[PDB]
Design a protein around this ligand. Structure first.
Ligand SMILES: Nc1ncnc2c1ncn2[C@@H]1O[C@H](COP(=O)(O)OP(=O)(O)OP(=O)(O)O)C[C@H]1O
Ligand SMILES: Nc1ncnc2c1ncn2[C@@H]1O[C@H](COP(=O)(O)OP(=O)(O)OP(=O)(O)O)C[C@H]1O
Ligand SMILES: [Mn+2]
Ligand SMILES: [Mn+2]
Lengths: 176, 175
């Protein structure tokens, strides 16, 4: 389900959580993770070498699923790769040796569901609110426009309207 | 293999038979035997890591199936590794960060344990046979205690100063 070097993703503010959850049942979504606490440690060089390339690098821990991930997003839009890791602090220390250090941390509650080829995330960030992301990962750059349009259609199906789309990342929304 | 530091002493081995008797006597436990290890070393285009006494390796060990991402340095004691699922996925991620294959080192390796010590027995084409006595630690404030203990172990094991090799494999191979 998570296979690819491209991730096409749309983020929406969630105005009506009830309708979203009702649609997740109607469409027989399968829960991949439920109400996990997700702590993301963002890493960069002293001089923000990665941000200057529109790269983000994250070590993610999700509890109680026990998933731990090293994620490199970028450079620029729609590029994303991730690896499962056994130990966040181990990889964090390895990356510190290479010059990458904790820049800030983002915490959220997140559930992840699958419906056919699509992933749908339902997120809550203290102080910011409720969001949902609709995404599909692919290795094929030739269908990215089609895939993004399919995500927008799919989202509408959960009550997520064109006008609730949020182009800013959580890092941007949190002032980082 | 728990730690940030690998305290080691490396030796050329002149007689594998004596080593193998050296081993048996001391009741060594086999950990992995006769694995082909292929190490891809990565660096930035300006050899940025090497200029810092750092090496970064993706290691594949067959037939054990073990795959490791290793960051060594700065210097010859600091060492950390993480088991990885998919070598090509990690290599691509590191490529995004600007690290790309620089050279490859291959060897045959066997790893044995005698108590807290690891004894690694290596063969490299042309270069020959080597053995390393090693102890891992997380605590730099005990590096002295351990390097002494390695020396005492190597002495009672019969690996002698005249056979010591202070150079890394990359140094021996001119990389
Ligand atoms: N279990 C997993 N295995 C492999 N890849 C995964 C896994 N879970 C998520 N990923 C991938 O890693 C990427 C993580 O980015 P994402 O979760 O979108 O960040 P975020 O917290 O939503 O912040 P943004 O606002 O999108 O920057 C998205 C997804 O395609
Ligand atoms: N199975 C394993 N799990 C975790 N770490 C391991 C495992 N096997 C070996 N390691 C660690 O990786 C380290 C790699 O360094 P090492 O194996 O000494 O490199 P080398 O090929 O002998 O080259 P040098 O000449 O020593 O620089 C050593 C050890 O601390
Ligand atoms: Mn996202
Ligand atoms: Mn060694």
């Amino acid at each position: 389900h998570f296979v690819g070097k491209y991730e096409v993703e749309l983020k929406f503010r969630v105005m009506d959580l009830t309708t979203l959850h009702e649609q997740l049942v109607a469409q027989k979504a399968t829960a991949f993770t439920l109400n996990n606490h997700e702590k993301d440690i963002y890493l960069d060089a002293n001089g923000q070498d990665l941000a200057k390339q529109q790269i983000s690098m994250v070590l993610r821990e999700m509890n109680p699923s026990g998933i731990r991930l090293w994620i490199v997003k970028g450079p620029g839009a729609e590029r994303c790769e991730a690896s499962n890791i056994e130990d966040v602090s181990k990889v964090q220390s390895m990356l510190a040796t290479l010059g990458y250090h904790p820049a800030f941390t983002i915490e959220k509650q997140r559930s992840i569901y699958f419906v056919g080829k699509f992933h749908i995330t339902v997120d809550h960030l203290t102080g910011l609110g409720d969001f949902a992301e609709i995404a599909i990962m692919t290795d094929d750059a030739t269908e990215l426009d089609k895939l993004k349009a399919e995500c927008r259609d799919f989202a509408n199906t959960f009550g997520l309207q064109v006008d609730q789309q949020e182009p800013r990342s959580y890092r941007q929304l949190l002032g980082f």
